[PDB]
């Protein structure tokens, strides 16, 4: 069957505030957003078929001055790609990326992107989710903020 997903941020429903959250709203079937033989449900990408997948994420952060002063100009912009299952209550991080930044009020616009990618063993019923540090800084563009997976080989 050879499953895959390319999920892009749901611009309609990005969380507000500046505490780290678990991102649960993504498009699955519009623009470049697509999914086959995996399911997206309850804010999680669910693996349907055992296999080794390549997982990836691109996350973009932005701030313009018309949004007013930042709470602090000292930022740590992070992405965490985490795994859990419908069974176990806890989740564990697979990949991680980001950078501390200084975004001065002197400049009118700021931008930064994180990309992570990795090859992981996945089982039916396991669930991937994206956590980010500053929800309100997220770039709503489909070419900016996305994550995905595609099966590369069987478990055997």
């Amino acid at each position: 069957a050879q499953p895959f997903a390319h999920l892009t941020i749901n611009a309609t429903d990005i969380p507000s505030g500046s505490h780290k959250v678990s991102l649960s709203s993504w498009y699955h079937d519009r623009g470049w957003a697509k999914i086959s033989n995996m399911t997206f449900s309850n804010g999680k990408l669910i693996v349907n078929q055992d296999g080794f997948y390549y997982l990836y994420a691109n996350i973009c952060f932005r701030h313009h001055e018309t949004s007013g002063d930042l709470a602090t100009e000292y930022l740590q912009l992070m992405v965490y790609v985490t795994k859990t299952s419908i069974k176990i209550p806890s989740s564990h991080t697979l990949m991680k990326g980001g950078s501390t930044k200084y975004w001065s009020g002197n400049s009118e616009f700021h931008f930064y992107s994180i990309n992570v990618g990795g090859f992981f063993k996945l089982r039916s019923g396991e669930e991937i989710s994206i956590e980010v540090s500053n929800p309100s800084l997220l770039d709503p563009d489909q070419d900016a903020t996305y994550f995905g997976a595609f099966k590369v080989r069987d478990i055997d």
């Binding site: 079937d29 519009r30 623009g31 932005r62 313009h64 018309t66 616009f109 931008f111 563009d141």
Partner: protein, 166 residues
């Protein structure tokens, strides 16, 4: 022999393309013509097309100082503009701060949305004593309104000076 537009050739036969608002679900077969289905919510195609799927409307991100001037539909793209005091810059793909006109210069009016300020030198009888991306040249004060006489004349950078005699 197919018309270059509105028609396309496949399997050696002439097939009709999809109208704007619709995408090509499946190409013409030996038994039927093209199957064209409407674009999904917030999706569009603006031409007579042979497209696999529809395009998603761009986001007029308020977080980028953007606002929609035209919302778009299944037939037309959404159009955004930089909000007041900013203009679009295609190098940063961002809403840049508008250029300030120096003293002795004023902002050309009327002020265009999404377009950078144009600066003109102030004409005789007008002046500008500020850096501003919005302000045009203001006219010199007329001393008679103040019940005074003109002491010395103004410049393009500074105002007239009024004084009361005796």
């Amino acid at each position: 022999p197919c018309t270059q537009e509105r028609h396309y050739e496949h399997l050696g036969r002439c097939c009709s393309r999809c109208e704007p608002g619709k995408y090509l679900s499946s190409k013409c077969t030996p038994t039927s013509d093209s199957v064209c289905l409407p674009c999904g919510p917030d999706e569009y195609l603006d031409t007579w097309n042979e497209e696999d799927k529809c395009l998603l409307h761009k986001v007029c991100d308020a977080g980028k100082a953007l606002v929609a001037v035209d919302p778009g539909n299944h037939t037309a793209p959404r159009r955004c503009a930089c909000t007041a005091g900013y203009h679009w810059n295609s190098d940063c793909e961002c809403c840049r701060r508008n250029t300030e006109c120096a003293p002795g210069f004023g902002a050309q009016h009327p002020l265009q949305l999404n377009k950078d300020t144009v600066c003109t030198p102030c004409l005789l009888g007008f002046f500008s004593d500020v850096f501003s991306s919005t302000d045009k040249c203001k006219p010199w004060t007329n001393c008679t309104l103040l019940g005074k006489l003109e002491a010395h004349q103004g410049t393009t950078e500074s105002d007239v000076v009024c004084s009361s005699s005796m």
